Amino acid sequence: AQGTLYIVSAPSGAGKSSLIQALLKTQPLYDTQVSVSHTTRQPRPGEVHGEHYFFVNHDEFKEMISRDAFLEHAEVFGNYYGTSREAIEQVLATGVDVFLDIDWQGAQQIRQKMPHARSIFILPPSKIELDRRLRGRGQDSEEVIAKRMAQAVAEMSHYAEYDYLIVNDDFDTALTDLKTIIRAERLRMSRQKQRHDALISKLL
Amino acid sequence: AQGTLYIVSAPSGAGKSSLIQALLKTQPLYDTQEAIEQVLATGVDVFLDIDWQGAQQIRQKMPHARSIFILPPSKIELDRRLRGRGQDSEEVIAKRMAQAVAEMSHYAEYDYLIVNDDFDTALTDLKTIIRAERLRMSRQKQRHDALISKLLA
Amino acid sequence: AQGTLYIVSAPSGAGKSSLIQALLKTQPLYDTQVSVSHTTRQPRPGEVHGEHYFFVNHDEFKEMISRDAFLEHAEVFGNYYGTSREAIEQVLATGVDVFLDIDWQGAQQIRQKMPHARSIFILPPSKIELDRRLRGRGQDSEEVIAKRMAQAVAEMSHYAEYDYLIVNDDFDTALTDLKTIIRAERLRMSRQKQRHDALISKLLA
Amino acid sequence: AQGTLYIVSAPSGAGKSSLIQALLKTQPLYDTQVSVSHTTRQPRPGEVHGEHYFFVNHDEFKEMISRDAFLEHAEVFGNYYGTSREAIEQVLATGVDVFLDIDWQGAQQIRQKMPHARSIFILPPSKIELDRRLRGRGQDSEEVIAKRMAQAVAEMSHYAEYDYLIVNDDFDTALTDLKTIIRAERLRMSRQKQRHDALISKLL
Amino acid sequence: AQGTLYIVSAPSGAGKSSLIQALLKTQPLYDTQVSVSHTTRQPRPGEVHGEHYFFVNHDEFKEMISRDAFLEHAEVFGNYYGTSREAIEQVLATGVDVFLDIDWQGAQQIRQKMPHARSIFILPPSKIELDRRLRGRGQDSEEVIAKRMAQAVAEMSHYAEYDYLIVNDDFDTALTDLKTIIRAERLRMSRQKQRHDALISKLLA
Amino acid sequence: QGTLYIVSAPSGAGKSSLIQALLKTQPLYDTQVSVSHTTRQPRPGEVHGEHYFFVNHDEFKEMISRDAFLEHAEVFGNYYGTSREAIEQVLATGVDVFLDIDWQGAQQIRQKMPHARSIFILPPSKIELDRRLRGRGQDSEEVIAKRMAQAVAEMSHYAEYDYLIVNDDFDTALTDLKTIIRAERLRMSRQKQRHDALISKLLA
């Protein structure tokens, strides 16, 4: 019946997105889905309304802000982004687990209005490795790198606010850790009593 | 530092003991095994094989202990498994089947529930729970103290 | 030399097509392929002839129908849909395993003209779960749901007509079951005698 | 309800015994067992009646041969060895799969009186590898090696009589091949119809 | 700091490209990448510069040829294709492993000038199976087949020049073999000392 | 064709359990443990050949003289050393050999066996090493410091080795050890050997 909301946070260079993406390629829609943000920006090539984003007009957004329709929202680089409340609750009602990819700030807003939500934080395996991963292609000014490293340490500060902690050294290991958390939760008494209603009847 | 106490219950014919065994064969003593609290203080996870009675007594004086209940995949399969070798009086079977049903009644009192159909799958489920708990913030913060420092300054 | 034909049937909500797709992403073309179906309809965005369907004319389709150029066919929602017999026997000749995704009807038609073909039936883990899976996104009329649930029961009735039965609870497990069946068949004497001809000579010196 | 009887044959140097032992270490008794042979020979240290054999006296064995209670029996280096039909039938009745380890002679005898039994033949990956494995510890006379190799080729001749064929190159892969066979058989309509009776009702 | 360059060769029919492809779907960019390769032809739809190819002028390409800016190159169905020395060294400097898919010829040129580089050769499990995979769809002239088989044998000749050897029987096993090599190399003392610098300090205080 | 694996690690790295686990899932014609030579007394169950190569204090002295050992020392009275005859006999049969020793014996063996490869196992952190070293948690702080000192001495000849496994998760670590073995078996040298017959047919 009721799905779980998983809040996933991480600094840039922990593989947070790659990881949530990998997990979805091996799991049906009736089991696990990615949360879909509302945004004001222009769709890019490939992007489709309903899948990558809920693309709406600057006006439609402000209506939604005023009628407290979002669970969290923020302005970024010139456009508005937020996670609809209605969108999340509908999916959960069908018994699907939802992955919400956000920063520590959105996290606390959701943990607030969604106290049943669980939260997972991903970290890099060392400072050196995080540096390396942040440097991406290796063609960036030392001043843009230090600003990215600063932003990362800011993110990582709120790590203790979270329910689970994954250290992402080996990608595969980290993906199994994520899969493990999902599976273990589905073995909680609450949901097993639901999923096995018929069987548990026959035995008793 | 601090380990977890796993209370494991199940009726006969669920595989409770065989399962806890198989799990101890691929896991070092510094990870999984008064006498209870000593081990837990060394950061080891303890598996306590008992019945619903013991369970409630331990849930009592050990409120931080987590509990796992194992069930047969059907009543037909439970019957079969209970019958063991197939050389038993039909009246000793029913007494075994009764005791099992009495056990299964208390399943809702537990934290986790494994349905043991495929033994391999059930063994993974058990491991999964173990791993998931070790990923909790409490325990990871402990185990990664040094790393977390380096990342923040 | 000789490949196998795998008839896969299942009611909506068992994961039948997602399963067959997942299987194809981890298996080369010289080992496993899905049947491709001749259609008379329009190729939408992404859809190409050969890969997605074998898009043909209404006339070209109507010719094929006359000279028995089909393994199964009928009419759905406006157009014409059929599974070509020549296209099957060709791929099977090259030693490839073929997956034929259909309903219980085409199944009996094929079990007929392909008595050597094996059949796999996938089922949901319970009625409650079936209901839920069928309800898809959860924005559908109770009457359209009951019509789907009905159609599913009708399909499920024919289950015992099949060689293997997979209960699709955990998707991953179900996928391994599908693979296990595939692997086990290739372990049969018939095909192993073939595949290891060189080695079996040397040992029997 | 009804389990399968698995006749397993192989030449020395294929890993036939190790394999079956490996399989039994990760499977409960209510699913898979090995067959236990009647014998007239003396139990060694560790060997127990009911586990490693069915140790009987010469006359008891003869009574049996007489009343056709065996599914096979031979005379080796001085003693008798047999497969009680009662012992096998009892276990299959409980729905357990049985693994019977024998030569090609026993195979045909059983194929005969047990037409529903399946047979698996394991082969070495090459004659060079077979030689090597047969040499065991590397301390044997060339005329004892040649007699074992001769015996091996004699055994491998009957390979075509079997249902499945496993090429044991990598031990782990071959063990998966064996496990694969078991699992695929359990997926047959015959046994699945049985195991999921309760569910198939509810669905209809 | 230093990534390894993996030179991968195989005859047609070993699944060399499918293997490298499969490997990249389960591995992050900051761990493993495919070679770019500079070319002169037209950027089709979806095909970005930097990602799919390093597209350039027939002039810019001609300059690069003169000042030995390439690792290998030739002419194919009209245009110019080649992989650049600079493009490889840049990626390996960020600690990424690079997969270069080439023939024995380019292999030798690269063994020659490339520092941290290892080579892997893939082979079919038999001649009958190599035949079958080469026959592809099954609709080819016995003379085009003999020409593809001749080219294959020419390719398999140089197998002994290579560090590792994968026999591609079962595709999944073969992909595990490839993954195994990648992992083992990252367990070498050279790279582990690098990756675990902070940890090794603390242990040695 | 075979390979000798030198495995070293400080106490609390899992070195023994790891080599033990590796042997249970692998046949004798593929992988074995090194049987070392000693002068002391055969305890109950301990068979010459299996557990040790037990020799007279004199036979051991002969063997030290004509440089028959790969490594040796004195321990709590007696003499312990690596029999190079025993090693070479096995490797000749194409079996990989595992040698559990300290950094001292290592160099002695890297010396007379330059083709042998070396693996070093480390604990995931100092805190975890401490905890693992504290075994049951009933030891004097001075017996703990003496073992932690002995570890750090052992843990500093690490660069001398070919491969480095960090044993955090026991299962991950065993996969690492298995990975190394497999990757070595995929070397051209040994693959030319094992697939000789196949490579002929291909180049027809």
Swiss-Prot record, chains C, E:
Residue sites binding ATP per the record: 10-17
Guanylate kinase-like domain mapped to chain residues: 3-183
A GO CC term attached to the entry: cytosol
Subcellular location(s) of the protein: Cytoplasm
InterPro entries, sorted: GK/Ca_channel_bsu, Guanylate_kin-like_dom, Guanylate_kinase, Guanylate_kinase_CS, P-loop_NTPase
Domain of life, source organism: Bacteria
GO molecular function, one term: ATP binding
Pfam families in the record: Guanylate_kin
Gene3D superfamilies: Guanylate Kinase phosphate binding domain (3.30.63.10), P-loop containing nucleotide triphosphate hydrolases (3.40.50.300)
UniProt-listed SUPFAM superfamilies: P-loop containing nucleoside triphosphate hydrolases
UniProt keyword terms in alphabetical order: ATP-binding, Cytoplasm, Kinase, Nucleotide-binding, Transferase
Catalytic activity: GMP + ATP = GDP + ADP
Family: Belongs to the guanylate kinase family.
Organism field: Escherichia coli (strain K12)
Name the record gives this protein: Guanylate kinase
First-level EC class: transferase
EC identifiers of the protein: 2.7.4.8
UniProt function note: Essential for recycling GMP and indirectly, cGMP.
Oligomer and partners: Homotetramer (under low ionic conditions) or homodimer (under high ionic conditions).
Gene expressing this chain: gmk
